[PDB]
């Protein structure tokens, strides 16, 4: 089948596409470079777009990567943007780690401060702003939602696209931008 139905459906996912991704996943990188989410916004300007990092795939600093993406989600939403914008914090944050891993072939980060600072500088924020955010109820809610990314990723791998929190697309059904546009229009308009 071209998609499966999630049960239960995801919270805070009405009128949306969520991409579960890993910064070590070359197909994720390809969608990032290609601008898949920006192009989906172009075709579906009514939808919201969110990245779900898959912590089981993100290595030594996987918990801290989730912290930085949760912050980026919160800040982008505050600013009326989301991950389908090239200037968003979420997109900038994904870019710096994709570049680190795939184009600078950085196997590891020396230590946690070095890892964190790469994300802090990509988002042009200081550590105090992120750590203060992590003590708030909204941070715990956002991180709690990311927990589902691992189970979502086990079905078919990454990236996993999920429409309206309910319909998870089988990657074998996607062979072009047009295919993915067609499935999002079909699935976005079901119950």
Residue numbers in the entry: 4 to 194
Sentences from the paper on this structure:
In the monoclinic CjDsbA1, the C-terminal HisTag as well as 3–4 N-terminal residues could not be modelled, and in chain B, two residues (108–109) on the surface could not be modelled. The superposition of monoclinic and orthorhombic forms of CjDsbA1 showed relatively small differences between them, which was confirmed by an RMSD value of 0.45 Å. The active site of CjDsbA1 was observed in the reduced form, while the CjDsbA2 formed a clear disulfide bond. This was due to differences in protein purification procedures. CjDsbA1 was purified under reducing conditions. It should be noted that the CjDsbA1 redox potential was the highest among the characterized DsbAs so far described; EcDsbL has a redox potential of −95 mV and N. meningitidis lipoprotein NmDsbA2 has a redox potential of −79 mV. Previously, we found that CjDsbA1 present in wild-type (wt) cells was present in its oxidized form, but it was mainly present in its reduced form in cells lacking CjDsbB; also, the lack of CjDsbA2 had no impact on its redox state. First of all, in E. coli JCB817, CjDsbA1 formed higher molecular weight oligomeric complexes (~46 kDa), which disappeared when cells were treated with the reducing agent DTT; in E. coli JCB818 lacking EcDsbB, these complexes migrated slower when compared to their mobility in E. coli JCB817.
The bacterial proteins of the Dsb family catalyze the formation of disulfide bridges between cysteine residues that stabilize protein structures and ensure their proper functioning. The oxidative part of this network consists of two monomeric DsbAs (DsbA1 and DsbA2) related to EcDsbL, which cooperate with one DsbB. The solved structures of both CjDsbAs, especially the length and amino acid sequences of their L2 and L3 loops that are essential elements of the monomeric thiol oxidoreductases, were different from that of EcDsbA but similar, though not identical, to that of EcDsbL, which affected their functioning.
